[PDB]
């Protein structure tokens, strides 16, 4: 794949790793909608709202399969470790008007 998943389900905001690149989800938006990282970086999304949110990459973007991330409740987090350069678009499954991208370079 182009990313590995440290944890298939969400974990507490306080448990975010040292060195992770954090994207907040607040005000019904990915607060960094275009994030630039390097190969081997871990990106961690943190849901700051009552409404659940995820990140969803369609098939062919992070790998053969779609990556439909788990729904994060308020103050939960979810990480992806990017292992290959590219441009990776995502949305929220529940709220597809929420769009973001990670650029790995």
Provide the annotated binding site for Cu cation: 53, 92, 95, 98
CA distance 53 to 49: 8
DSSP string, 8-58: SS-EEGGGPPTT-EEEEEETTEESSSEEEE-TTPEEEEEE-SSS-B--EE-
Number of residues that bind Cu ion (CB under 5 A): 4
Residues between 65 and 94 with contacts to Cu ion, criterion CB under 5 A: 92, 94
Task: Give min distance, CB of 7 to Cu ion, in A.
Answer: 19
Q: Quick one: which of 29, 48, 95, 99 contacts Cu ion (CB under 5 A)?
A: 95
Binding site for Cu ion (CB under 5 A): 53, 92, 94-95
């Amino acid at each position: 794949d182009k990313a590995t998943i440290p944890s298939e389900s969400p974990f507490a905001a306080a448990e975010v790793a040292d060195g992770a690149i954090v994207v907040d989800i607040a005000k019904m938006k990915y607060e960094t909608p275009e994030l630039h990282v390097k190969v081997g970086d871990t990106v961690t999304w943190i849901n700051r709202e009552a409404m659940p949110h995820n990140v969803h990459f369609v098939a062919g973007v992070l790998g053969e399969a779609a990556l439909k991330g788990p729904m994060m409740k308020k103050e939960q987090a979810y990480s992806l470790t990017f292992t290959e350069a590219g441009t990776y678009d995502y949305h929220c499954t529940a709220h597809p008007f929420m769009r973001g991208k990670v650029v790995v370079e």
